[PDB]
Symmetry: C2
Subunit: 357 residues, 2 copies
């Protein structure tokens, strides 16, 4: 079968909103790391709206931080409407999913991993001036052929990128295929039936907020597993680590990744859920899709013994009170093994393998 995922660059209007939301979070967290933050962003042609709920001692110039963020991405009236120990109960109810699999060394499903890499690549080539006619907004779609339930080839890659008006399509499409697409695709998967569609709907001069309204939390599938796993619904950006929407999904990834790196399974899906004002999850379950070496329920039991899934437990486990979140807000929260991203360390793998037998 053919399976497809997608990603967007840091310049996509929705990601502009996510990154503004998280730039603001990091600024707050730099001064007062215990702050409660629920920062929502809407951005438009002439308009940025910053809303949601904030509790802090920090003093931030929210407008300057939005402008700095838009500047760094590469591109307004501003409306600011904020309303400004381990047994602590969850601040809200909800469900969260974590996932991992052996399709890549980072233990992410292939299609979303390639999709993120394609847009990261175009941003890299923009910012180092190799393709100086590139502009911020970009979109990738990668369709992967599976045979034997394992990746076989890459059927189609679609990449649309914003660009300066001075360049013609023919040369743009050739440049993107040769410089963006081909180098990012693993050679073992590249075969005769590979289709490259670059800028299928033609000229793409106007991009970002100026071309299309963007909102925080509207790329939650691009942020996570690109369609390879179910999702609980919660957005990440703008939320401090006391919000289980973010902390529990991050812990889910940690758990799932450690189960697979432990050798317990070749893939692992974990659902967690919370009730408001209750520390222990209302539910936890692990599904290994028939690939587990020990029963899913025993893995579920091991998860409880080896990870602290209580909200403040997870903060302490992944050391989350750090201004590290603007970096999370483009190119996927999962699958990038940066030092800051504590949820990507397989540092419980050996302990899990040992406990299982």
């Amino acid at each position: 079968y053919l399976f497809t995922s997608e990603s967007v660059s840091e310049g996509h209007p929705d990601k502009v909103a996510d990154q503004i939301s998280d730039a603001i979070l990091d600024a707050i967290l730099a001064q007062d790391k215990y702050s409660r933050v629920a920062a929502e962003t809407l951005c438009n042609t002439g308009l940025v709206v910053l809303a949601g709920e904030i509790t802090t001692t920090a003093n931030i110039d929210y407008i300057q931080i939005a402008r700095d963020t838009i500047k760094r991405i590469g591109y307004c009236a501003v409306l600011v409407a904020y309303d400004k120990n381990l047994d602590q109960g969850a601040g809200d109810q909800g469900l969260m999913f974590g996932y991992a699999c052996d399709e890549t060394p980072e233990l992410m499903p292939l299609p979303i991993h390639l999709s993120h890499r394609l847009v990261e690549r175009q941003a890299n080539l923009r910012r180092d001036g190799r393709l100086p006619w590139l502009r911020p907004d970009a979109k990738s779609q990668v369709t992967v052929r599976y045979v034997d339930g394992k990746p076989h080839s890459i059927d189609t890659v679609v990449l649309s990128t914003q660009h300066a008006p001075e360049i013609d399509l023919p040369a743009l499409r050739e440049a993107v295929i040769e410089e963006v697409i081909k180098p990012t695709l693993p050679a073992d998967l590249i075969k005769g039936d590979i289709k490259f569609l670059v800028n299928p709907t033609g000229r793409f001069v106007i991009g970002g907020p100026q071309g299309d309204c963007g909102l925080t939390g509207r790329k939650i599938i691009v942020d996570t597993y690109g369609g390879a796993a179910p999702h609980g619904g919660g957005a990440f950006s703008g939320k401090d680590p006391s919000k289980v929407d973010r902390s529990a999904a991050y812990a889910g990834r940690y758990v799932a990744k450690n189960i697979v790196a432990a050798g317990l399974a070749s893939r692992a899906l974990i659902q967690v859920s919370y009730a408001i004002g209750v520390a222990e999850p209302t539910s936890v379950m692990v599904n290994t899709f028939g690939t587990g070496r020990v029963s899913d329920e025993t893995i579920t039991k091991l998860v409880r013994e080896h990870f602290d899934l209580r909200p403040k437990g997870i903060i302490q486990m992944l050391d989350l009170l750090r201004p590290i979140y603007e970096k999370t807000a483009a190119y996927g929260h999962f699958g990038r093994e940066e030092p800051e991203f504590s949820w990507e360390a397989a540092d419980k793998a050996l302990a899990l393998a040992e406990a299982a037998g």
Copy 2:
């Protein structure tokens, strides 16, 4: 097939949850536009706060709409009766093989856990919050207010529902009512009458307003945005999701119409008795009509090969963007009603994607 014991959870929110307010405003505006011009392009986004509604997005139409009156009417209908409104739409005046207007992946799903062919936990979650709305509006529980959330945890054994483990229900309420009386009322009136009798065992846990009082609700107590309840809108986590929000978008957006078609297909597969459950995944490429990929996974429950089912789907359904609109007659102002209590699993006459009107043909084909 494999012996199992596990807990699975879904959630829903009432029509007065701020994100749902935003979704409903977005779709009320879509409805009003379509009333006057059913070929309109609408991508209407809403953000609402304490004393603030922001309406933004892209709209191409001949309709003349009082955007503020529609937002106000919607808020009033939900139960919330200065509220400044900022209208910043990018507005302008303007075959079956036409291409998709954007790329995306969409999933459709159906299973036999409920008569409506939806997975149980999202079903029960929705009905719990509909029940609190009903009891509010007919005055049986007049102290209730619009904002509420439900969450239902189901213990499955051998791949089948066995008992209800936990029900959470948080509801806004008048300051007049005391917490213990609130909780007893919610357990006996809202929760118990909604749960299936045979799934209530001795180990059931009711978590009603666990952190107590809840007087300031809706936009006043938290910000709402369009497209922030997309899991509540679909299958509660029982299926994968491809990304796209529904509300504020006219049927020409494949994010909405292909999701609906997907449900349609998946539901007719199960209704036909071809499978006890069906997941269908479809992908579109910008400017391409016929979709990239169409696959059906019955998870070992299909009475014929998955391949035969996927083949049957292409003979019996038109999955091209404009084909879906004709097949489901999507050019009608029917969307505000979708914007709370789930887009799937409610068998309203307007909801074309919930009709099992091809099941007989699929059954007759496969041999069921």
